Structure 1
């Protein structure tokens, strides 16, 4: 396939930001629940 160059290039720094927020968005809420399992298990 061929394509145009990006209309809104996403630089390495912007990719690190997108990847980090994507990762925290799945890791943090599950991490919180699992960290506190014992507070639930005997709550």
Structure 2
């Protein structure tokens, strides 16, 4: 396939931000639940 160059280029810095935000959106809420599992058990 061929394509135009990016209309709104995403620099390495911007990719690191998008990748970081993405991973955190998965890891933090589940990490919060799992870390407090002991507090849920025993209720």
- Consecutive unaligned residues in structure 2, runs of 5 or more: none
Query: 1:41: how far off?
Result: 0.4
TM-score normalised by length of structure 1: 0.98
After TM superposition, the runs of 4+ consecutive aligned structure 1 residues lying more than 3 A away are none
CA deviations over 1:2-40 (Å, ceiling 9, x no partner): 000000000000000000000000000000000000000
Count of paired positions: 43
What's the RMSD between the two structures over aligned residues? 0.4
TM, length-normalised to structure 2: 0.98
